[PDB]
Amino acid sequence: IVGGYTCGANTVPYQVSLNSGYHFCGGSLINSQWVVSAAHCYKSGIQVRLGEDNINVVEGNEQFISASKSIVHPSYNSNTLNNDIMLIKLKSAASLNSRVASISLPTSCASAGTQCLISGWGNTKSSGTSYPDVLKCLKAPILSDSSCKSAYPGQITSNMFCAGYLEGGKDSCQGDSGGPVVCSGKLQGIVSWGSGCAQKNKPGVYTKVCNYVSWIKQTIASN
Amino acid sequence: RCTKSXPICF
Ligand SMILES: [Ca+2]
């Protein structure tokens, strides 16, 4: 997260870290057994880390649980990033408490100008690289689809939206992929892609979760 | 344009 702020330990209790001997992507806990992340975050050997603040120190409140299923959307296109969503089933149910909690799925899509919370352990620099120990947070509005398409002509599908700023300085970045965009207590977005990070006129692009609520439901119920 | 992962660029 570039241009954000330290969230505070366990203030985003649905935020998870996906770990393969290092933090590689974020995700969101949606019930005791299931995590939503990005399809492009798929790999073998995923350990889900819940209740994290400092990802480099065992502080208390962590739960490390292996992924038992990693389900990429069958129509995920790695060329266009359309359908950039993945479901991870945990080996054992997480213990839910104040510091480890699920986030609600949307009942409807969000509108332009809705203010959302984007969070992660990604790069904090727009130029070069700095990775934080603790979780970072950013408040960011959903942009109009006209403005989103103007920024990225021919590249924004019905399953994507833009959020953030056009003036530069505030954005999600490398290492934040798969993590949450939460608006009015609903998981509306998944950190997906963009042109660089926090660059003028290049807002972040996010998977539009409201389009997948039925798929998520049908997939969990059958697994 | 890149994904925001440990990046996949185009
Ligand atoms: Ca920790």
- The reply to whether domains A1-12+103-210 and A13-102+211-222 share a CATH topology is yes
Interchain CB contact of B9 with A (< 8 Å): no
Query: What CATH number belongs to A1-12+103-210?
Result: 2.40.10.10
Fold (CATH) for A13-102+211-222: Thrombin, subunit H (2.40.10)
**Residue of A17, A84, A176, A192 marked catalytic:** A84
Name which of A82, A98, A3, A5 is nearest A39 in CA terms: A82
Helix, coil or strand: residue A96: coil
Helix, coil or strand: residue A2: strand
Torsion, CA A185, CA A118, CA A14, CA A108, rounded to 10? 40
- Residue length of chain B: 10
Technique of determination: X-ray
> Are A152 and B1 inside 8 Å of each other by CB?
yes
Alpha carbon A113 to its chain centroid, in Å, reads 19
A-chain residues near B9 (CB < 8 A):
none
Resolution, given in Å to one decimal, reads 1.5
A108 is in an annotated binding site: no
Interface of A with B in 95-114 (CB under 8 A): none
Domain boundaries, chain A: 1-12+103-210, 13-102+211-222
A73 has catalytic annotation: no
- Who's near A218: CB < 8 A, 6+ residues apart? none
Q: Compare CB distances from A191 to B2, B4, B6 and report the shortest one's residue.
A: B4
Tell me how far CA of residue A4 lies from CA of A11, A64, A114, A120, A156, in angstroms.
15, 26, 18, 10, 25
